[PDB]
Amino acid sequence: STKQRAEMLKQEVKKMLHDVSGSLQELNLINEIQRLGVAYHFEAEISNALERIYNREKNENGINDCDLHAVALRFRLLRQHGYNVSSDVFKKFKDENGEFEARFRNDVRGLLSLYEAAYFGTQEDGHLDEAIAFTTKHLKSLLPHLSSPLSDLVKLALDLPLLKRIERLQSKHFISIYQQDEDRNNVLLEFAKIDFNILQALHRKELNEITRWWNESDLPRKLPFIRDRLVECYIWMLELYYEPQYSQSRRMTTILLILTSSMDDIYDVYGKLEELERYTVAVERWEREALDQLPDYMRVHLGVLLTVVENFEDELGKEGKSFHLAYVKKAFAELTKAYIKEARWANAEHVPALEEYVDNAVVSSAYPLITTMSLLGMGKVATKEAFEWTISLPNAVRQCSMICRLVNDIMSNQSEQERVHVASAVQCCMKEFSTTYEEACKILQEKIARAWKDLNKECLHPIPVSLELIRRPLNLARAIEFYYQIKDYITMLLVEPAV
């Protein structure tokens, strides 16, 4: 059947990767495996290969290579795994003063590799800032008169690099483009085609159960004003992590992201502040007895929240790890502590200071709750230390919420401001000094780049936790970039399979 064919292809690819252990073919094969959405099948072998590459790196046993593609791909592959390889290997190509050599203008492959490698630099990284402008200029110059199978890659990359691109949609696009390339591998492409079909089948199957749970719930029939966002809540928990072993982790969190959104609306689109200051204490206490005095719709919403939380506790109690949900309840404690502040600013007719507003909005984005609540379905990574680290609000969690808040704000500050809503970041920054809407938008756009550069730094080897746990903030930051660029996502990532 398909599974035996997939296993045979997996062993074939393992044998080839072993046989190319010393050449650039290893780098190309690892890159193609990662970009085809099958990188998780070869975690151990890829880790060993990258360890060997790092050991023979740093000019200790490294042969000088003039190929921009080879060194750029090596740097990008090593930086994606954690190794702190210095961004100084690009000094060789900066021969003509501080500008890159002109002989690379016509090298579209090396230019694109440098383009994708440059975005992975950190704040302290050098030689990875003017490269973006260089490659942008030359790729735009050479785009109109370029051949189709590589102009497709150029057009796919100019919109967003691999750093800011969700992995599943980019994997689909690369599988679609890789057919036209004449230097491809047939077995790797077939393996990716089979794996994509199986993972898409699993992803489509889970949505059926989630929709069944929503239908059986009391949420949709009553409380009419809630806007149904079940699909756009699964796709946000589909690009965070899509591996099959995390399937149990995608049911439990998506069920609790519709509840955390319904709550946002309950606090801003409507409701009076007197009535909202009694919801916060009810959430903090976390008992059904606190629901007696609440209004009907808040009572129903928080009762459903309590029911789903206790149901999830019952499920994690089989393996003796129910106490993890003793950390989720605390997280929901802070979120309502942030929603209840902004509403007050709505009623007091006050414009918060930018720093205070940003500090409050980092918790009112629910990216801090979504980083704690994603550990529910992790088998061995979910430990007490991991949950304590996640609750302690590390810098990695903070820098993935900056992008959310600041991008949303810029996009959705016109629909709500007409009605009674909390002042957004652009209005807060226009409050001090004197700036226009566009000049404040550019200021708020100059912060997303620094947030991305700060998020790139946290995923290195000086890490308190594992790589699987730290990968989540990066994917959370990538999902706001896909939205603010969606029936195409549903129709050709979940409905239309790959031939």
The yes or no reply on residue 152 touching Mg ion (CB under 5 A) is: no
Decide which of Mg ion, ligand FPS, none touches 181; Cβ closer than 5 to 8 Å per partner kind: none
Residue 415 CA to residue 44 CA, distance in Å, equals 49
Stretch that binds Mg ion, among 18-26, 63-71, 262-270, 387-395 (CB under 5 A): 262-270
**Eight-state DSSP code of residue 459:** T
Question: Where along the sequence are the contacts to ligand FPS (CB under 6 A)?
Answer: 229, 232-233, 236, 257, 261, 264, 268, 364-366, 404, 408, 412
| Angle made by CA atoms 133, 139, 140, in degrees to the nearest 5 | 90
Shortest Cβ 451–Mg ion spacing (Å):
17
Cβ contacts of 456 within 8 Å, gap of 6 or more: 120, 121, 122, 163
Contact (CB, 8 A) for 189 and 267: no
Shortest Cβ 253–Mg ion spacing (Å):
21
The yes or no reply on residue 215 touching Mg ion (CB under 5 A) is: no
Residue 270 CA to residue 254 CA, distance in Å, equals 24
- Our CB check for Mg ion shows the closer of 372 and 424 to be 424
Residue 100 CA to residue 91 CA, distance in Å, equals 9
- Our CB check for ligand FPS shows the closer of 257 and 340 to be 257
- Our CB check for Mg ion shows the closer of 347 and 412 to be 412
Give the residue from 237, 258, 348 showing the smallest Cα distance to 304.
258
Which tokens hold the place of 252?
């439990």
Shortest Cβ 36–ligand FPS spacing (Å):
27
Residue 158 burial by Cβ neighbours in a 10 Å radius (0-12, 13-18, 19+): middle
Tell me how many helices (H) and strands (E) the chain has.
22, 0
Q: How far is CA 472 from CA 94, 231, 303, 368, 459, in A?
A: 35, 20, 29, 11, 10
Which tokens hold the place of 254?
């998506």
Decide which of ligand FPS, Mg ion, none touches 261; Cβ closer than 5 to 8 Å per partner kind: ligand FPS
E-assigned strand segments in 41-165: none
The yes or no reply on residue 412 touching Mg ion (CB under 5 A) is: yes
Stretch that binds Mg ion, among 202-210, 260-268, 310-318, 453-461 (CB under 5 A): 260-268
- Our CB check for Mg ion shows the closer of 179 and 412 to be 412
In this structure, how many other beta carbons lie within 10 angstroms of the beta carbon of residue 120? 22
Stretch that binds Mg ion, among 97-105, 141-149, 410-418, 457-465 (CB under 5 A): 410-418
Residue 9 CA to residue 186 CA, distance in Å, equals 10
Decide which of Mg ion, ligand FPS, none touches 315; Cβ closer than 5 to 8 Å per partner kind: none
Decide which of Mg ion, ligand FPS, none touches 340; Cβ closer than 5 to 8 Å per partner kind: none
- H-type alpha helices, 182-293: 186-216, 231-234, 247-268, 273-285
Longest dimension (CA), the chain: 75
- Our CB check for Mg ion shows the closer of 50 and 426 to be 426
Shortest Cβ 489–ligand FPS spacing (Å):
12
Binding mask 287-326 for Mg ion (x = CB under 5 A): ----------------------------------------
Decide which of Mg ion, ligand FPS, none touches 284; Cβ closer than 5 to 8 Å per partner kind: none
Decide which of ligand FPS, Mg ion, none touches 204; Cβ closer than 5 to 8 Å per partner kind: none
Residue number with the smallest Cβ distance to Mg ion = 268
- Our CB check for Mg ion shows the closer of 425 and 477 to be 425
Shortest Cβ 425–Mg ion spacing (Å):
8
Shortest Cβ 499–ligand FPS spacing (Å):
30
Shortest Cβ 490–Mg ion spacing (Å):
24
Cβ contacts of 183 within 8 Å, gap of 6 or more: none
- Our CB check for ligand FPS shows the closer of 85 and 166 to be 166
- Our CB check for Mg ion shows the closer of 38 and 480 to be 480
Shortest Cβ 373–Mg ion spacing (Å):
20
Residue 388 CA to residue 431 CA, distance in Å, equals 37
Query: Which uninterrupted H or E stretch holds 426?
Result: helix 425-431
Shortest Cβ 481–Mg ion spacing (Å):
17
Tell me the residue length of the chain: 499
**3-class secondary-structure state, position 351:** coil
Decide which of Mg ion, ligand FPS, none touches 25; Cβ closer than 5 to 8 Å per partner kind: none
Sole binder of Mg ion in the list 26, 32, 268, 481 (CB under 5 A): 268
Residues that bind Mg ion (CB under 5 A): 268, 412
